[PDB]
Amino acid sequence: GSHSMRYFYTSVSRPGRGEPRFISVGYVDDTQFVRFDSDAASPREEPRAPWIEQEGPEYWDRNTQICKTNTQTDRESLRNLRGYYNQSEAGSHTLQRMYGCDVGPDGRLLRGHNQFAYDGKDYIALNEDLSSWTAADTAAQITQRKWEAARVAEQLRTYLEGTCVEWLRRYLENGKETLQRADPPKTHVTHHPISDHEATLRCWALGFYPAEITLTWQRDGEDQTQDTELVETRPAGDRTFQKWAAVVVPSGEEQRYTCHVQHEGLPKPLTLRW
């Protein structure tokens, strides 16, 4: 199906405790493949997936160099942002960036991404046209003006439509045995008496990849959206994910409830009962 590559940058200032720490991680879909940490004894872009290891020294040297430059640029940005908001040098602040590309089954660019957040709030984003910006406030407008004058959007467009998609395609091929393999959820229902009057039915999905999944409870064929407890999808630690959905049911009425599971690893959606 469709695929994505994403880089996630986080820089956090820490007045009195050195310069802002820069962390970078790279993902293809739900699989991390690289990491960089400016606090590391010897900061280097490092492999986090088996299929990226085959890349040569030039790859690792070039990407390390880019990460080191980005470490410095983020520190400049943090200084600028502090000023844009009239903030003191005493506080700690966070700058986040995510960027990358989405491709369809034919490897064609679907969409490009490039956006930033400051202290957890959206700050500025490259629009889907890859040619204009959306600024959240008057501070981000300053950034926008700078980047328009420097024609940053055009440079990003070139990267997103070229380099980004080319690397994603390469990664998808080199790691095809995993990246292009959907692992279906292993599903079952458990029953947990609460009292004489009711019990919990919990629908489980385990060992699935990618993370995207839909679990729903129906009663008499009606979705129980408002009455269903859904936990956040969580990593098992072996590349796969887990999730459950639970409803509280009247004792003896269990058979009126059905769990429905959708996942790209499944030919047809599953229906489960206690």
């Binding site: 970078s24 980005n70 600028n80 700058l95 700078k146 940053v152 380099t163 980004c164």
Partner: peptide
């Protein structure tokens, strides 16, 4: 693989 465009906010 990373973008090589260098522009501070």
């Amino acid at each position: 693989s990373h973008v090589a465009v260098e522009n501070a906010l």
